[PDB]
Every structure is written in C-alpha cells, then in structure tokens.
Design an enzyme around this catalytic site. Sequence first.
Site, PDB file in Angstrom:
ATOM      1  N   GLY A 137      20.314 -24.336 -38.912  1.00  0.00           N
ATOM      2  CA  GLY A 137      20.459 -22.911 -38.672  1.00  0.00           C
ATOM      3  C   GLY A 137      21.175 -22.291 -39.848  1.00  0.00           C
ATOM      4  CB  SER A 185      13.891 -32.099 -44.280  1.00  0.00           C
ATOM      5  OG  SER A 185      14.194 -31.335 -43.118  1.00  0.00           O
ATOM      6  NE  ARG A 220      14.453 -30.587 -50.148  1.00  0.00           N
ATOM      7  CZ  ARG A 220      13.172 -30.845 -50.422  1.00  0.00           C
ATOM      8  NH1 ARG A 220      12.218 -30.151 -49.810  1.00  0.00           N
ATOM      9  NH2 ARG A 220      12.832 -31.784 -51.308  1.00  0.00           N
ATOM     10  CG  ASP A 241      10.999 -29.939 -42.582  1.00  0.00           C
ATOM     11  OD1 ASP A 241      10.384 -28.866 -42.789  1.00  0.00           O
ATOM     12  OD2 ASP A 241      12.240 -29.998 -42.394  1.00  0.00           O
ATOM     13  CG  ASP A 290      17.616 -33.012 -44.590  1.00  0.00           C
ATOM     14  OD1 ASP A 290      18.299 -32.447 -43.722  1.00  0.00           O
ATOM     15  OD2 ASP A 290      17.052 -32.383 -45.509  1.00  0.00           O
ATOM     16  CE  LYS A 328      20.952 -30.821 -45.128  1.00  0.00           C
ATOM     17  NZ  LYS A 328      19.556 -30.370 -44.774  1.00  0.00           N
ATOM     18  CB  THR A 370      18.300 -28.909 -41.742  1.00  0.00           C
ATOM     19  OG1 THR A 370      18.988 -28.308 -42.842  1.00  0.00           O
ATOM     20  CG2 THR A 370      19.242 -29.869 -41.039  1.00  0.00           C
ATOM     21  CB  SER A 418      12.873 -26.936 -40.654  1.00  0.00           C
ATOM     22  OG  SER A 418      13.377 -27.790 -41.682  1.00  0.00           O
TER      23      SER A 418
END
Lengths: 241, 196, 233, 246, 220, 246, 203
Positions: free
Chosen positions: E47, E169, E19, E166, E17, E33, E1, E129
């Site tokens: 998390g 993400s 995902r 990432d 993002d 999100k 994320t 992340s």
Amino acid sequence: YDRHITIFSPEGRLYQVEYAFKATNQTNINSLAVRGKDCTVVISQKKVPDKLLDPTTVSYIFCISRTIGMVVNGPIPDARNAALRAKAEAAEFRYKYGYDMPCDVLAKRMANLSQIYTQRAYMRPLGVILTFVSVDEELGPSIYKTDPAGYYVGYKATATGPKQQEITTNLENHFKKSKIDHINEESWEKVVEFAITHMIDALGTEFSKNDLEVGVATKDKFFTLSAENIEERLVAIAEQD
Amino acid sequence: TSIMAVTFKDGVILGADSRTTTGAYIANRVTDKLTRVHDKIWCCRSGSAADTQAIADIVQYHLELYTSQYGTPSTETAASVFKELCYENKDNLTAGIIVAGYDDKNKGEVYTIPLGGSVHKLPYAIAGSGSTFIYGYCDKNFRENMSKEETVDFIKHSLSQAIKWDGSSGGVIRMVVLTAAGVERLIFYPDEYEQL
Amino acid sequence: TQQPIVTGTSVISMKYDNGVIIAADNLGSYGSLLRFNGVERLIPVGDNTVVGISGDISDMQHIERLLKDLVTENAYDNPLADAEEALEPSYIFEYLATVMYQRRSKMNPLWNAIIVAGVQSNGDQFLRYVNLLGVTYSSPTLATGFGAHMANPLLRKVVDRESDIPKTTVQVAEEAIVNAMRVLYYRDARSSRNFSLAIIDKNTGLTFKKNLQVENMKWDFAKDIKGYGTQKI
Amino acid sequence: YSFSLTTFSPSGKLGQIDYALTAVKQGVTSLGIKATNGVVIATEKKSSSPLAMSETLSKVSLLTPDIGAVYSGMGPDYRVLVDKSRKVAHTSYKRIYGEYPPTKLLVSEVAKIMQEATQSGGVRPFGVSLLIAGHDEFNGFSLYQVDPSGSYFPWKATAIGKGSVAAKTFLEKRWNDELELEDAIHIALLTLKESVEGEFNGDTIELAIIGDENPDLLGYTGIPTDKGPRFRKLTSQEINDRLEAL
Amino acid sequence: TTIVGVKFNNGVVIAADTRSTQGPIVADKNCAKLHRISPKIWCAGAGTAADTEAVTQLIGSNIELHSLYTSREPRVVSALQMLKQHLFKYQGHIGAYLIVAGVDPTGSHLFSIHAHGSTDVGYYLSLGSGSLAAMAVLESHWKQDLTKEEAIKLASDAIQAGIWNDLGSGSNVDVCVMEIGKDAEYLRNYLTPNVREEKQKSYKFPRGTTAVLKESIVNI
Amino acid sequence: MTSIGTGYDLSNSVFSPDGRNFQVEYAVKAVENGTTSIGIKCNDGVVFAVEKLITSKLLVPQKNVKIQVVDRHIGCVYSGLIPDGRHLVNRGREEAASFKKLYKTPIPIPAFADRLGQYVQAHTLYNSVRPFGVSTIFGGVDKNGAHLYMLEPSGSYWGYKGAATGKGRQSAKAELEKLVDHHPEGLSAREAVKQAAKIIYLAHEDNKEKDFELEISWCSLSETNGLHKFVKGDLLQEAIDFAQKE
Amino acid sequence: DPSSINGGIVVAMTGKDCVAIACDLRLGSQSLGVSNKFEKIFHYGHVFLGITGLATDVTTLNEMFRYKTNLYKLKEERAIEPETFTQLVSSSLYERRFGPYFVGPVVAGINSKSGKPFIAGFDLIGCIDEAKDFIVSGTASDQLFGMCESLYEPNLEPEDLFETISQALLNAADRDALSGWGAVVYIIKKDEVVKRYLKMRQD
Ligand SMILES: [Mg+2]
Ligand SMILES: [Mg+2]
Ligand SMILES: [Mg+2]
Ligand SMILES: [Mg+2]
Ligand SMILES: [Mg+2]
C-alpha cells in the site's frame, strides 16, 4: 491547609491520606485472601445486625471482570466507586489491547489513580483498601492489594481490617511451617475451608453461614458463594459429631 | 456472503458461508462470519468487513461492561446495542447484521438489523448478497420448533443453494448452536453440501 | 437520514361525525424486495391519539421511542396524567412538527411522512400531517405517498367539505377506508394485502384492529385478457 | 485550587519543596556509582510485610534500553514518574529521531515534569529524588540525581534517603576514577550493608547496571548494526553470589 | 510488492520482495519491507509506503510502552487491535496493508490487516500487487504441520512467484522466522537472485570533462 | 461523637483524624428533622408511604405530592430537604432514560440503586458541593422481583425488607420489625398498604402537635402490573380507617 | 500538480569517503523561466539537504529544518548527524500526512563519528529511500535514474565522483523543459567541502 488537603506537612507527611487509612476500619470487618495451587480465595466478615436489611444485598466483594474479583475494606460508597471504576478499566483494557486485564495490571492502574488523589488538592482519597484476586493466565493465582496512598504489592496471602495483624501472623506461621507460598489443595472448596478455619482461629469466634461472604477465582472465572454453599463449607470443617 | 440464523425448539442456530471477496478475488476462503459478543449471544456478519468487525468489537465491549455492572444482558439488549451503533452511524457503515441468542425463558431469539439500522425480531432471518436467491426456498421449508437435526439440515440446504447461485458466497458452511447445553461449532465442506 | 432503506408506503385517514380513522399496511420494503410483513406503522399514544408513519422504518422506530418517552415524561410529577393533564393529539403533533422541521433544517431529516389522528379533550377531531420537510396541513382526509394520489380522491367523495363530517358515520368512513386499502393493493407495487386500522372515537375510545386482510377482489375478467393487441388466444 | 500550593515564604524558601525533600530524606537509602566501564544503581527492598512478595514490585526501573532509575521517598510518586518518563522518551524523542534520548536529556525531561508540580495550580510537588544511570554514544556513561524541585546534578557517586550522610562518606573514601564496573558493584554492596538494618541478601537488595551491550537480551538476530541494551538488572542469585565471596 | 505469511509446527515465517516503485520506476532495488513491531513481532507492508512505515512505528512504540507498563511480553493480538482501531478511525485514508506475524506467551500468530481496519487470520496469507502469484504457490504447496525449513522454502517460493510474475515486485527475498521459544531470526537478503550483470564498459569520464564556471571552498 | 469535629467539619470531603466526614454526618442531622417516610417490600411488589405535615390549613389538601415516579416502574420518597430530593430524582430520571435508550429493557432496580449511590457519593468527594440532605427510600419490580432500597447522604445504600427515615423513624422501624417477625410467609401488597398506613400513623406521634396527611404508593406485579401507581380511592380510605382503629 | 509548477532537480551520490550532491538553478512558473539562481541545496552543520518541488515549500522546509537543527545543537550540545536528520525529515513530513509539503527532499553527508558516507531520499510524506549508491529527485527524475544507473560505479574518488554526478545532472536536465538553467555541485569529504557552478545550456 495541610490537615485538610493532600499537601506536605513539615514532616513530609500527608495527613488526609493517613486519615483515609483510618476510614478503612470503620465498617469493623476483616478480610483475608489466600492462594491455592490453582485458585484464589477471598473471605470477608459479614455483619448485618439490623433485621430490616436484606442480607443478600450486603456485600463488600465485587466481580470486576470474568476473571478478577475484588474485596474492599472501607465504607461501601467509596467501595462501590472504586468497584465501578475498576470494572470500566478492565473492560476498556480488553477492548484496546485484545486480552483480559491481568490482576496486577488492574491493581497498578488503580494504585496510580489513587496516587493522583494524593497529589491533586481538589480530590480526596478514597477511604478504602482494595484486594484484587484472580488466577492470572501468566502468573497463576494472584493477590494484589492497593491502599489510599497509591501503594500496591503482590502477596502470598494477606489480611485487612481492625484485627489484621492477628490474621496476618496466623498466616505467616502457617507459611513458615509449610515451606510453600500457597495452600496445596486443588479443590477450591478445600482452600475456602482452609481460609475459614484460619480466620475462626485468629479471631477467636465461630461463624454461621450469615457471618461471612466468599469469593473464589479459578482459571475460568471469579465467582461468589451463596449462603447455602458457605454453609456446606462450614459443615466440612465442623468438629462436633 | 450468505448468513442466516434460525430459532428452533431448543435454542438458535447461526449459519454462514466463509467467502470474503474484493472484486472477483477471494481474499479469504475460510472467513469466520459467526462472531461472539457474549456467551450465548452471537451475530452473523455481512457488508464491509471493517465495519462489521469494528461494530461487533465495540458491542462486545459494551456487553462486557454491562455484565460486570448489571448482570447477564438479554438477547434483545444486545440487538439494542447493535441497532444504536448501526442507526446512529448509518451514513458511514455498510453492515447487515443478524443477532441471535439463547436464554432459559425465550429459548432462541433472532434479530436482523438491515442497512440503516432498523431492527426486526423474527423466528428466522437470512441476509447477505446470497440470501436473495433463497427467499422462496426458506419460506417453503422453515417450520417453527424444529429439532436440532432438522434445523441443521434446513440451514445446510439453505446456504448450499445460496452458495450455488451467489458468486459472493462459497467455501465451507459454518454453524454455531446456542442452547442450554452450551455452544457448539459445526462445519460442512463443499463435498457434502454441494450434493444436497 | 440521507436516503431511505427500509420503507412503509401509504398511511390514509379521514374524519367522521364522532372521531377519526387511520390505516396503514404492515409491509416494510427494501427496494423492490417485499422484505418484512408484520410491521406495525400505526402508533397509539395514550387512549386518544394514533400516529401513522410512512417512509424509512429505522426513522419510524426512532420516532416511536420519542413518543413513548413523551408519555413517560408527561407522567412525572403529574397527578392528572391519565386525565386533565394527559397528552392531547395537538401536543403530540406540535412536538413532532417541531422535531421534523428542526431535523430538516440541520440537513438530517427523519425521512418520513406522518399523520397524527385523535380526539381532543373537548371532543374535537384531530387530523394533521407532517413530513421530512416540516410541511404541515390538515384536511378532512389525509393520505401519504401513493395514498395521496388514489385514496384521497376516493375518501373525498365521502367527506368533501367540512359540513360532510357530521353526516358521516364510523360505519361509512370505515368502509371508505377499507375500499381505499383494496385499491392501493391493486395499484401500489409496494403495498401489502395485510393492514392495521384504528378508530379514535369521542365516545368509544380507541379501537385498534390488527391483521385486516384486503378482501372481495376482482380478478375474474383477467381470464379474458389475452395478448396486447392482435393475439386472439 | 487554581493557584500554586507551592509559594515563597518571607525567607524566600519554598516550603512544599523543602517538605518534599524531608519525605525523600525519610525514604530507604539508595545510591549510584559511576565506573569507567559502567554505572551501578542500588537500593534496599524493605518488604512492609513478610506475606508481601517484594519481587512483584520494582524500585529499579528501565527507562530506555540504556537508561535506568532508582529512588528514595514516596514509592507511588516514583511509579508514576517512571510511567511518564518512559512515555516522554518516545513522544518527544524516539518518534522524532528514531533514537532513544541520551541520558542528560531524558533526565532533563523528568526534571521538567517535577518542576511543573512545584508551580502548577492545585498540586503538591513529587516526594521523591531519583538517581538515573545511563549511557549514550556521544557522552558515554553518566549518573544524575533529580530532586523534588526539578534540580539535577551529575555525580561520580552519591547516596540519597535515610543513611545517605554515612553512605556519601563511605563513597568519598572508596571512590576513584579508575573503578571498573565490578569494583563499583562491590563498593555499592559494602555501602548498602551499612544502611541495611535486618536481612541482607539478594532478596532484600535491588541492583542494576548500565554496562556493555547485551545482544542476548535483544530478542532477535539478523540486524548486526542493532545494539543490545546496556541496562541489566541483577538477579537474586547473582547478588547473593557476590555477597558470599564479599 | 509481494509479502506472505506462513505458520509452521512451532512458529511463523514472514517474507517480502525488495522492490519499491515510484510509478513504473524502481526507486529502491534493495528495500526493506520486513518491520519489527517488537523483538518477536514482525510485519510486512504493502500500500502507501509512508503509512505502512509510520503506523508500524506508532504501534511499535505503544506496544513497547504497554509492555513496560504491564511488565509483560507484547502480544500479537495487541498489535492487531491497536492497528485496526487506528486504521478504522482513519476510515481507509491511512493506506496501510500489513501481514503481522509473531510469537508471544500465548503461542504463535498470523494476521492480515487492510486499510479500512478489517483483519483476517490463517495459516498462510499474502498481500500486495504480487499476492495473486504468491497465493497460487501457497495454494499449491501448503500442507499442515510444516517444519521451519519447509515454511521458509514455501514462503520464499511464494515471494519468488511475485518477483518473477508481478511487475510490482522484484529483486530479493527477505525472511523473518519467529519460532516459539527462540529469538526471532531475521534473514536479510535470504535470496539474491537478481544481480546486475557486469556492464560492457566503465563510464568514468576523464577528469576535466565537465565545464566549470566557478569554484569555492565551503566552510562547515 | 465528638458530635462536633472542630477543625475538620468546616468543609465537605475532609477526613477527620478518625477517618470521618463530618459534613456527611451533619447532612444526616437535617434528614432526621424531616417527616417520616417508609417502604415495605411485599410478596410481588413494594409500597411507599409518607407523613405530610399540615403546617397551616392554608395548604390545599392532596396537593404538594411528595412521592415521585422514575421511569414507569420506580417510586421514590425521601425525608429531609425536599428540594435535594427532587434534585436526586431528576438525576435518576436521566440515568433511567439513558439506560433504557442503550439497552432497551427498563433499568433494573439494583442498577438504578447504584446510579443514585454513585451520584450521591460523588457529592462527598469535593468541597465545591455539599452532601444531599435527604435519605431516599425507593424501589420497584424488575425481572428479578420486588426490590426496596434506602440511600443515605454518604452514598451508602442497601436493600431492605422494610425501611424508615425521618423524624419518627425509630417508632416506624420498631413496627417494621414486628411486621417482619409476624410475617415469615410474606405480606400481600394490599396488606402492606394497610400496614403502611398504620405505621405512618404511629410514627406521627412524634409530630403530634401538627395535623398530617397520608400519602401511599405501590408497585406490584398483580396489583399494578409492575408499574408505579399512587394508592387512591377506596383502598386508600380502607387503609386510613384501618390505621385509625389501631 | 504542485510538484511540477516551478521545476528543478536534485541528485546525490556516494563515493570513497565522499558524498556529492547537486542541483539545477531554475525557478520558473510553468513555461516562463523566472529565476536563474534558485539553489535547492542547504546545509545544517555538516549535513546537506537538497529539495525539489514547489519552491515556496522548498524555502519553508529549509527554514523549518534550520530551526529544528539549531535547537538540536543547543540541547544535544553537538551537531546533528545525517542518519538522525534523515528520521527528522521523515517525521516532519509525515506530520503533514493529509496536507503535505509538495517536495522531494534528499539528504547527503558524512557521519562525523563513523566517517561513513550517507544519502537518502523521501517522498512528499516522508517515506525514506534508504538506498546508498545514488538518490534522484525532481521533474527530470526519470532522466536522472537513467543517467545514474548508467554512469555510476561504486567507490569513486572525489575527483571522479565530480565528473559522474555532473554528467548525470547535465544530461538529465537537457532532456527536461522544466529543469536546468545552471547547476551547483558539492563534493563533500571529512575535512573539505568544494562547491562548483557548472556551465550548461541556457535553453
Ligand atoms: Mg487530593
Ligand atoms: Mg458461490
Ligand atoms: Mg519526479
Ligand atoms: Mg532542461
Ligand atoms: Mg528554453
């Protein structure tokens, strides 16, 4: 039962609450609260006849929080019970919500506690009227007053005591004439002076520095006056040379 | 973290670095570890950030309640409240806290409360990962009753050196000055303190 | 306490003909960091008792407060609190012993070793030990932690058996104590050079000596110790 | 006081509930009118001092975005019910389904709260009757009265408090099943005008409607599926506007 | 994320993002999100996804009650205290990590909050992340006194850094703009830089391809 | 006055139609039957004195101590139902210890006064207890100097220059008032001790039939280092001799 | 881990004015296959719920949801919608945050009012997969993801959706030791629901 606990009489009345209102006049002193442009002033008579008393410990005004002051009409022990409770509520509020408890929110909260004593048999109402003042960060100068019925409302100005109708009508007349809902003075001193002058007028008595006590709310804080500052105020309004 | 507090002739000065890390990642490079719990009573924070924020928050609440009921609390009283929370919950906190205050009688006071919750009144205190490196420096350079300027310099020099050696320290140097004249916030940037 | 953080090392003590002596250095350690240097670990309770404490300094402070509270409580409605009905060393001890065993038994120890020293109302010396386990004992000398290992053997040369007690003067006992403090400074890596000493005497009362320093040390010979075997210079 | 304070008398009546109703009958008139495209609820704002600022108090309360209430009887009992009603809407409904409760079920929860005060030990019944106006997707617009007993009935229109007998009569004559919200508002005003002794303007009258969704009251854009609230309280200005061209 | 927050001269911007991942698998390629605490207070989470969503709802509900009770617009600092106290009480076991942004009567605010209950404040923040990639962009291109359009661009560039660098993400950028004096502006799929190319063929089966043993009508 | 509030005086926490609590006023009548006790605020301290009635020669002299200490710095003396007095002091001791435990500094006198007050007024809140049948005179030294208070069965308390309660309170108050008039510049602690003995002696003429014993205590910056101490030995006898001369 | 003791899979897909949901029939205990008829798909009114994971929890959740939806219908006087049921499932799961049911539920259905096809998935503590092409769950979820992303296209007719979700399930199952042993497929439209039992490998 209905003359002793908070249950309905056949007329749908609550006697113990009505009687609780009677208790509020037992100290035989009047208070008034007035709003300025940028302050709120609370004033209350102070009658200390017994010369063995320390007059500096006699007070019906309380600093609830940094910004909220309270003046109580009624016997001092119910007065101090409420004062302690409000102080605790105001602290808890700031801790939980991360900002200072507004004056009207504290008033509502105490109103609710009060309505509960009118509904639960085992608790008696407090015999008190609580006037809350502050300069609220959102609402500006504020006066909210609560009674033993659990009722509260906001005020342009208010008065409480045995001679409250006198002072009230004195204020209404002034606010009619003036066409605004507050006193147009920036100086809290001028607002205090105003309040002393109109209370002197409505009660048909003069005051020395020992006959009253004064609280003042500003944006920064609520504070009470020493007898020395009160005197200084009395001088400002002295009409004799 | 590198935190200290230093009594001086007119009151007390708190200082801190501004670095918070998780692992080797600097999660916050401009942290404010200088935390107010009453007008002229503040604290420096080291250890778990959740723990020290949670502690200071509850201590601020206790002293607010104290004030409306009893009047102005003393620096000692604030240290007492911190201690009680740190000692009683020792098995579930990582908090190294320096409590520092001003009042008209004592002028400046400093109480350090290490892990475990003991409490120690001191003329000055250093703490946090970075303080290890400046024990010898601070011992040789601290005097009682320094002026404000001499005291700022002592802390600037002290924390500059701790930041130099400690990976867990860095960023800007924050200072809070507690005296009769009130509360003053200072800041010093790397390009100043790194040359000392 | 599940594990100690800030700590005090040895408390040591002995009886002599007319009273008891107890001493402890002024250090609060933090692992191997010699962190705090004006930490008083002798705690006078009234004029007849001194409680010396080693171990976790947070727990020591908590016990200090328990003791002050006893003093306070004992005085309530007690017209003879400064006399017949004052706290005896034996009362202070029994209380602490009760507390230490209770905390051990709740798996939450006060992480300390404690010696209680004083004089009872009948003039009897009082010297008794209690620790984080609730273990208790008396002996003409007592010492905690490191001091048990080096001070005791020194002190027992002075008062070896009960009969040595009336043959022992303050002057002699105090010298023995101070010498032991010097020896601990030589060999205990967690000791300090600065210490407190208290004498409780059936006649002269409590005498509390703060800021003693270990003196008269031998380091001389060190100039001649070179290498670790074969090195000559 | 661990025993009921509401008990049956030999006539089978429950005195404390009756006396609660008496308190209600003594209160300032309030009323509700259900239209085809909305519901209106209204009451008078008797200020118990001219130095009081009546705007700082609110007799008409939003319970959910689509549900509001007004009352006659003891104000503080009402205030407290309002707090409880808002919370139960979240705790027993929105936190489970992610949706606000439909009107009849929220009315039902408040009814429970009131019933409980008439049976639990150590307490008097609430001294209020509520009118509750709502909308929900599957029932449309509705209007309920809850009494101190916890009884509730659905109305097309009704009045409660002091001038309710004449008001219910007035409403019987003017009501038909094709009123549009604007008719219902107009009729509510004419109705309240009888009960009103003293001043009668946008400042002594409180009035709210449950009507169309107001996207402009949402506070954010971007979720097009997100409905605006149907509840809206009329300003002083808006009320005076209608009063002049009455 | 990857979530970020960016203050500008007249408000704050939040972005994420889209995902969500069951391990190394993507469950939802176009997830949402950016959550609303209240109309003008929005938060983004990383998390444990259930904790992030649940705690969002809890506080949102309470903030709403608080607001109705006090007759005041909810304040970002209120969401902050309520969340951190709740998360602290749970000693880290509610694995919520949030950036919370908003405007209220006192101004515009930007905070981060971690599972153990600690909070930070700044002009630009990142979590999840992909926060190191995003923060590298923020540290390269932030300046004081951003306009709305500049803070959107910067936050959107930062999410992109995580989307591209990432593995945690990916997919789209969502933003919410909370300007002082205005309605919050939620921009769902503000950017959609990852559309699947057309497949090489349709995999529709001829009807009757699948063997059936038995069949029956079910009655609702 | 109607001294008897018929129908409203049968249980505590009931308001009479004139807003009185008769049980509290009755509790006061018991206080008025107690022996005289007084307090005198002095320049850097406070002094307490009480009349102790020798009901029988079987009483052992100098036992049956009435003045109590709270913490180390506060004295309490009360008139009326003595066991109610111990009960209140027990509460004060817990409150004091609890304050000292969190905040480290000894409980300030006005803070201690309010703890006792809230507890005493809490006993006017419910019919499941009765009010305290004592008035309590108490105080000591804190960071702000000497403080002296008197606390009534209602929970009411104020600070005083001098305070008297119990049977001979009118006489004592009169002498306390003369004392005030005669000492605008202040009163030393030693002086206050002697003057206290004189006053208890004069008040005793109300219980003149029985013998009495005098008990005196003080708390003074210069005399007891701000700790509560019982006045004893020569100072006591010196005050006893002085009182007798008058 | 508990979610792979009994084995099994669920998949749901949207099509044009239809949804479909499917599951295998296996209940085993590790390597031992035990039941050849353990369906994992239930319904409350017109809302379908599939559940993979620990069989005892599969059964428990079903009973819990029949209970909750029955009360809903009584109180609300109408049957629960897929959107509302989805939230109910989420919060029921989250209520057991720290001692969860070891399940992977899947919701499918058509809203009686919009006529709009709806699906959703959940992790074991209630996190909602709002996705609306397909949802997969179970010990062959990797395989299912692969099959769905490959075979799926939007707005399939029910007859075509049937082939797609069948082949997705069948081929995913045959690459999983803990899934298979039979299957059922529901094709759900407004006025009709058809249940079918698929022929598959029995190893
Ligand atoms: Mg009651
Ligand atoms: Mg560094
Ligand atoms: Mg799986
Ligand atoms: Mg298989
Ligand atoms: Mg096989």
